[PDB]
Design a protein that fits this description.
Blueprint lengths: L3 H11 L13 H12 L8 H11 L1 E2 L3 H9 L4 E5 L6 E5 L11 E4 L9 E6 H4 L9 E4 L12
Antiparallel strand pairs: 1-6, 2-3, 2-6, 3-4, 4-5
Helix pairs in contact: 1-2
Length: 152
Protein backbone atom coordinates (compact mmCIF):
# COMPACT_ATOMS: atom_id res chain seq x y z
CA UNK A 1 0.00 0.00 0.00
CA UNK A 2 2.00 0.54 2.07
CA UNK A 3 -0.02 2.61 4.54
CA UNK A 4 -2.61 -0.06 5.26
CA UNK A 5 -1.42 -0.54 8.87
CA UNK A 6 -1.85 3.19 9.42
CA UNK A 7 -5.31 3.25 7.87
CA UNK A 8 -6.22 0.24 10.03
CA UNK A 9 -4.97 2.03 13.15
CA UNK A 10 -7.05 5.09 12.20
CA UNK A 11 -10.19 2.99 11.76
CA UNK A 12 -9.58 1.16 15.03
CA UNK A 13 -8.88 4.39 16.90
CA UNK A 14 -11.99 6.21 15.69
CA UNK A 15 -14.31 4.63 18.29
CA UNK A 16 -11.78 4.39 21.13
CA UNK A 17 -11.46 6.91 23.96
CA UNK A 18 -7.81 7.67 24.67
CA UNK A 19 -8.96 9.85 27.56
CA UNK A 20 -11.58 7.89 29.45
CA UNK A 21 -15.08 9.12 28.65
CA UNK A 22 -14.01 11.20 25.65
CA UNK A 23 -14.54 9.54 22.27
CA UNK A 24 -11.54 10.07 19.98
CA UNK A 25 -13.88 11.26 17.23
CA UNK A 26 -14.43 14.27 19.52
CA UNK A 27 -10.78 14.77 20.52
CA UNK A 28 -8.10 15.36 17.89
CA UNK A 29 -5.16 14.71 20.21
CA UNK A 30 -6.70 11.58 21.70
CA UNK A 31 -7.32 10.18 18.22
CA UNK A 32 -3.67 10.68 17.23
CA UNK A 33 -2.48 9.23 20.54
CA UNK A 34 -4.52 6.06 19.98
CA UNK A 35 -3.20 5.66 16.46
CA UNK A 36 0.38 6.05 17.61
CA UNK A 37 -0.20 3.64 20.50
CA UNK A 38 -1.52 0.96 18.15
CA UNK A 39 1.50 1.44 15.87
CA UNK A 40 3.99 1.45 18.75
CA UNK A 41 5.20 4.99 18.05
CA UNK A 42 6.22 7.05 21.12
CA UNK A 43 4.35 10.37 21.31
CA UNK A 44 4.57 13.51 23.40
CA UNK A 45 1.68 13.64 25.90
CA UNK A 46 -1.06 16.24 26.02
CA UNK A 47 -3.41 18.26 23.89
CA UNK A 48 -2.87 19.29 20.27
CA UNK A 49 -0.66 22.28 21.12
CA UNK A 50 1.46 20.15 23.42
CA UNK A 51 1.81 17.41 20.86
CA UNK A 52 2.86 19.88 18.19
CA UNK A 53 5.41 21.34 20.60
CA UNK A 54 6.85 17.89 21.26
CA UNK A 55 6.95 16.84 17.62
CA UNK A 56 8.56 20.16 16.72
CA UNK A 57 11.32 19.41 19.19
CA UNK A 58 11.92 15.73 18.23
CA UNK A 59 10.61 14.70 14.78
CA UNK A 60 11.83 15.31 11.27
CA UNK A 61 9.75 17.96 9.50
CA UNK A 62 8.71 17.46 5.88
CA UNK A 63 8.81 20.19 3.25
CA UNK A 64 5.29 19.89 1.88
CA UNK A 65 1.95 18.10 1.97
CA UNK A 66 3.02 16.22 -1.15
CA UNK A 67 6.03 14.85 0.72
CA UNK A 68 3.76 13.98 3.65
CA UNK A 69 1.53 11.87 1.41
CA UNK A 70 4.58 10.18 -0.14
CA UNK A 71 6.04 9.26 3.26
CA UNK A 72 2.70 7.88 4.41
CA UNK A 73 2.64 5.81 1.19
CA UNK A 74 6.00 4.37 2.26
CA UNK A 75 4.56 3.18 5.57
CA UNK A 76 5.52 6.05 7.87
CA UNK A 77 3.34 7.71 10.49
CA UNK A 78 3.02 11.35 9.44
CA UNK A 79 1.24 13.91 11.63
CA UNK A 80 -0.10 17.22 10.34
CA UNK A 81 -0.29 19.82 13.09
CA UNK A 82 -0.68 23.49 13.90
CA UNK A 83 -0.84 25.28 17.25
CA UNK A 84 -3.77 27.53 18.08
CA UNK A 85 -4.23 30.58 20.26
CA UNK A 86 -6.64 28.55 22.40
CA UNK A 87 -6.78 25.15 20.66
CA UNK A 88 -4.52 23.47 18.12
CA UNK A 89 -5.34 20.58 15.81
CA UNK A 90 -3.53 17.40 14.75
CA UNK A 91 -4.31 14.80 12.09
CA UNK A 92 -2.87 11.62 10.62
CA UNK A 93 -1.81 11.96 6.98
CA UNK A 94 -2.57 9.02 4.68
CA UNK A 95 -1.74 8.24 1.06
CA UNK A 96 -4.09 9.42 -1.67
CA UNK A 97 -4.56 12.10 -4.34
CA UNK A 98 -3.74 15.63 -3.15
CA UNK A 99 -6.65 18.04 -2.81
CA UNK A 100 -6.04 20.97 -5.18
CA UNK A 101 -2.73 19.24 -5.98
CA UNK A 102 -1.45 20.44 -2.61
CA UNK A 103 -3.18 19.06 0.50
CA UNK A 104 -2.92 15.41 1.58
CA UNK A 105 -5.79 13.19 2.76
CA UNK A 106 -6.15 12.66 6.48
CA UNK A 107 -7.88 11.12 9.46
CA UNK A 108 -8.73 13.25 12.47
CA UNK A 109 -11.22 13.71 15.26
CA UNK A 110 -12.38 17.04 16.69
CA UNK A 111 -14.42 18.49 19.53
CA UNK A 112 -15.62 21.02 16.90
CA UNK A 113 -17.70 18.28 15.31
CA UNK A 114 -18.01 17.45 11.63
CA UNK A 115 -15.95 20.40 10.36
CA UNK A 116 -12.88 19.02 12.13
CA UNK A 117 -13.55 15.33 11.53
CA UNK A 118 -12.21 13.19 8.70
CA UNK A 119 -12.48 9.45 8.27
CA UNK A 120 -10.02 9.46 5.39
CA UNK A 121 -12.52 11.26 3.14
CA UNK A 122 -11.24 14.82 3.55
CA UNK A 123 -7.87 16.49 3.10
CA UNK A 124 -6.05 18.72 5.55
CA UNK A 125 -6.97 21.57 3.20
CA UNK A 126 -10.65 21.04 3.93
CA UNK A 127 -10.39 20.38 7.66
CA UNK A 128 -8.21 23.38 8.38
CA UNK A 129 -9.38 26.92 7.70
CA UNK A 130 -8.04 28.58 4.52
CA UNK A 131 -5.94 30.88 6.71
CA UNK A 132 -4.31 27.82 8.32
CA UNK A 133 -3.95 25.13 5.66
CA UNK A 134 -0.78 26.61 4.13
CA UNK A 135 0.76 27.02 7.59
CA UNK A 136 0.63 23.37 8.62
CA UNK A 137 3.59 21.40 9.89
CA UNK A 138 4.15 17.81 8.75
CA UNK A 139 6.14 15.55 11.07
CA UNK A 140 7.34 12.05 10.22
CA UNK A 141 8.56 9.33 12.57
CA UNK A 142 12.11 8.01 12.16
CA UNK A 143 11.12 4.41 11.33
CA UNK A 144 8.35 3.01 9.18
CA UNK A 145 5.41 1.60 11.14
CA UNK A 146 3.97 -0.59 8.42
CA UNK A 147 5.33 -4.03 7.51
CA UNK A 148 6.09 -6.06 4.44
CA UNK A 149 3.09 -7.15 2.36
CA UNK A 150 1.69 -10.58 3.27
CA UNK A 151 3.98 -13.41 2.13
CA UNK A 152 1.01 -15.54 1.15
Amino acid sequence: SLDQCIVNACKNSWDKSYLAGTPNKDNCSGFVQSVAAELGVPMPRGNANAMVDGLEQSWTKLASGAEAAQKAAQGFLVIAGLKGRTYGHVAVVISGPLYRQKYPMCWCGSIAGAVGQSQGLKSVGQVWNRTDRDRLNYYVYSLASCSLPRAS
